[PDB]
């Protein structure tokens, strides 16, 4: 044999070793060809949906989602006892490669071992190809190890005007890159070292941004309490007062909450929503080169005010979906909606205004006038939390290679990397297909929980009530399932 079967996790000090071994089956895509693809074939009825690009015969491996590397238990173990984590090393092995050739005479096909076939598999470490991993697409290794999966088909999109290309478009030939070729006695391994990244914050702040103050003392600062003495003409006056625990709205604070871009508000009780088709017109959306595009998920913002759980920001959520969910027009309870509310202390709510500002200058003939600030970007002195990472969410994304950026952490959450884990492309050699094994390993560094807090934490736990099936487990028919999206913010720190 060309490799062994390793799946497990080792817990050593601050380190976690995540070992997954999966079994893949790769067919031949595009009948061994490259193909133009565009909107007009599929019908291209939108200027926002207009695209041009090429689908290539190759497949690729994608482990970029968490449920690959962490069993639901080891996720629970990690979340409850840690204040942060991040990847250190990467180790990937390809082995036990097989190539089956297909012969179908009339009704029934016969599949037999072809021993001399080769498999072409290379890794692009210079990021010369288009890199599609940071887009949260399907095709990643199945959460549950016994399941066998179909390796995705690679493809890419280059620049376009409508469906038509432009002279600055590009065409990348995956045959142009030197690629080791593997037979049933060959095995391909490489390793990778993660670049410096900040520990993911996996805690909920105990205190909010505006309650940082001491409740027992006054401030020495003063504020303007009264602009008139009473009812009548000529009451203009200036009165002042100490900012104190009596009125805490006004106390001078060092820090202020982060950015906001307002999302429309949708209720999960369908009769509180307006009787109109506001799904597309209503939603926030950013425009690029004349193409409109939705704002999704957007800046990291609390999902709803405290105490209001039937509301979710229209486009501003990560909405996963339950096992078995249909592709199109599925009912609202077929999907799972994540909520970021744990950040609501530091970050504004997505469906509310960040604040107000004063429009005019008051006089005897003018009232002080204010207006709603809908979208407020970074100002010096802001603090915020990023979006959480979930068992079902992405791990990393590639930071676009550009003049500059601010807070490179990706807006769907996870660890942004300029040199993320490289893409691994594979194909059959030019009716035949391959099957083989994959063992990927990551080494994670942990941040241990330091708290002196007296009273016990919120922990993640499996609820205690009899049910037909154990959660995070197979049903009777064999289909694995993930009942709900498990974020990591449970323990607590001071602000």
């Amino acid at each position: 044999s060309s490799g062994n079967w390793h799946c497990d996790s080792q817990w050593l000090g601050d380190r976690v070793i995540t070992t997954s071994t999966r079994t893949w089956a790769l067919p031949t895509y595009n009948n061994h060809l490259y193909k133009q693809i565009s909107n007009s074939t599929s019908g291209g009825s939108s200027n926002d949906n207009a695209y041009f690009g090429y689908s290539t015969p190759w497949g690729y491996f994608d482990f970029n989602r968490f449920h690959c590397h962490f069993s639901p238990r080891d996720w629970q173990r990690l979340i409850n006892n840690n204040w942060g984590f991040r990847p250190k090393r990467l180790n990937f092995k390809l082995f036990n490669i097989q190539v089956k050739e297909v012969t179908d005479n009339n009704g029934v096909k016969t599949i037999a071992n072809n021993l001399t076939s080769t498999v072409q598999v290379f890794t692009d470490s210079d990021y010369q190809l288009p890199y599609v991993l940071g887009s949260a697409h399907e095709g990643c290794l199945p959460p549950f190890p016994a399941d066998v999966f179909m390796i995705p088909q690679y493809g890419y999109l280059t620049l376009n005007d409508g469906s038509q290309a432009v002279g600055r478009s590009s065409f990348y030939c995956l045959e142009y890159f030197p690629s080791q070729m593997l037979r049933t006695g060959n095995n391909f391994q490489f390793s990778y070292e993660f670049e410096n990244v900040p520990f993911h914050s996996s805690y909920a702040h105990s205190q909010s941004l505006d309650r940082l103050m001491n409740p027992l003392i006054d401030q020495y600062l003063y504020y303007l309490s009264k602009t008139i003495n009473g009812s009548g003409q000529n009451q203009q006056t200036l009165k002042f007062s100490v900012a104190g625990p009596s009125n805490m709205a006004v106390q001078g604070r060092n820090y202020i909450p982060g950015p906001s871009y307002r999302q429309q508000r949708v209720s999960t009780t369908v009769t509180q929503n307006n009787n109109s088709e506001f799904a597309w017109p209503g939603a926030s959306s950013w425009a690029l080169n004349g193409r409109n595009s939705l704002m999704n998920p957007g800046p990291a913002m609390a999902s709803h005010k405290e105490g209001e759980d039937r509301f979710f920001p229209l486009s501003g959520s990560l909405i996963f979906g339950k096992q078995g969910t249909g592709r199109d027009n599925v009912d609202a309870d077929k999907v799972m909606i994540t909520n970021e509310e744990e950040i609501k202390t530091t970050n504004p709510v997505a469906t509310e205004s960040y604040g107000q500002v004063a429009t005019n200058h008051q006089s005897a003939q003018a009232q002080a006038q204010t207006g709603w600030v809908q979208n407020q970007g970074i100002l010096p002195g802001m603090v915020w939390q990023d979006r959480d990472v979930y068992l079902q969410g992405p791990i990393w994304a590639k930071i676009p290679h550009t003049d500059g950026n601010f807070h490179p952490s990706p807006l769907m959450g996870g660890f942004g990397m300029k040199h993320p884990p490289p893409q691994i492309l594979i194909k059959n050699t030019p009716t035949q297909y391959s099957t083989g094994q994959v063992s990927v390993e990551i080494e994670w560094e942990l941040q241990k929980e330091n708290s002196k807090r007296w009273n016990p934490e919120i922990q993640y736990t499996s609820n205690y009530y009899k049910s037909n099936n154990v959660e995070f487990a197979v049903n009777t028919e064999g289909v694995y399932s993930e009942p709900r999206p498990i974020g990591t913010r449970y323990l607590t720190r001071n602000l």
Partner: antibody
Amino acid sequence: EVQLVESGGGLVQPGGSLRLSCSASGFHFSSYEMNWVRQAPGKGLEWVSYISSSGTYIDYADSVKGRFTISRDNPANSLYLQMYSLRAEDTAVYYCARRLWFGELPYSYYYGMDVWGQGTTVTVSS
Amino acid sequence: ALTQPASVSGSPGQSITISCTGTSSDIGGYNYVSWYQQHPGKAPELLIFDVSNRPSGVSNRFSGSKSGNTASLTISGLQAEDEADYHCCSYTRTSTVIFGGGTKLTVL
């Protein structure tokens, strides 16, 4: 040790008014919803109204709708149902009940009513 | 509302099943149902929440099922304690709950 006990009221005249109050003891009252359901003497349960923990959502099944209000005081652990323009169509044992909760994070809902009040009889008769 | 029989009877030892039928907004579409036993002059006690889920206090013999556009309570191993009136509860499309006429169980 979870105890929902409501005082409420007895016999009252048609067209009159009544105020039912409930007392939650042994469990955290501010998290749960609360329901008012009624069982007419010979007939099955009917759900009059529910109130959210924060009080943001208060919805009435439409028989009453418009003639009752619902209120809850979280520091006082007490749910209130005040009713006006009573009819004979409203004579029932009124229950103070709460819906299932499991103490988790937001966007988690459970459908069923965990604990029930022992009831108060309301007789609206001319 | 939810339509369920007026009454059901069974002999001790044998499992029997009550059903409550509803519109696609009440049950057919949404998976919300729940079941309650009640004894005369006692506050109802929850048996089954969601469809098949059951609370810790409640006994084994009570299970639940949804065959679609319908929901059913299957009691096993009838005893004298099991005599009670069983109710069907399902939150609707508008998130306002509805019940059904109640069904008395008479153990012979």
